[PDB]
Write a structure and sequence with these properties.
CATH architecture: Sandwich
Largest sheet: 5 strands, antiparallel
Assembly: monomeric
Protein name: DUF3244 domain-containing protein
Number of strands: 9
Helix content: under 10%
Number of domains: 1
PDB class: unknown function
CATH class: Mainly Beta
CATH topology: Immunoglobulin-like
Number of helices: 0
Order of helices and strands: EEEEEEEEE
Organism: Phocaeicola vulgatus (strain ATCC 8482 / DSM 1447 / JCM 5826 / CCUG 4940 / NBRC 14291 / NCTC 11154)
Keywords: Structural genomics, Joint Center for Structural Genomics, jcsg, Protein Structure Initiative, PSI-2, unknown function
Distance between the termini: 17 Å
Length: 94
């Protein structure tokens, strides 16, 4: 099956945001689109951001991200909402 990327944090107002990876595609789903979002992925070796995307509310239900050309490394995944909401998970690209 696909691999769950567990998320921890606070997403005010069951968490509607879930993430999985299926091979080298990461999929985010949001069961209750209701705010603008930002997704940021940061490598854990240098703390460099490899991906950042500001996603308007209307487009926030579903996002795919190819991790296929990220270096083999562990990454921090953050999903933040405006004005609030902040979820964090971690995944490893092999």
């Amino acid at each position: 099956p696909v691999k769950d990327v567990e998320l921890d944090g606070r997403w005010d107002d069951n968490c509607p945001i879930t993430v999985f990876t299926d091979g080298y595609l990461l999929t985010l789903k949001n069961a209750s689109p209701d705010r603008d979002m930002t997704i940021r992925i940061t490598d854990m070796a240098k703390g460099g951001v490899v991906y950042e995307n500001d996603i308007p509310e209307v487009q926030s239900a579903y996002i795919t991200i190819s991790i296929a050309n990220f270096p083999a490394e562990e990454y921090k995944l953050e999903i933040t909402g405006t004005p609030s909401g902040h979820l964090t998970g971690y995944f490893t690209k092999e």
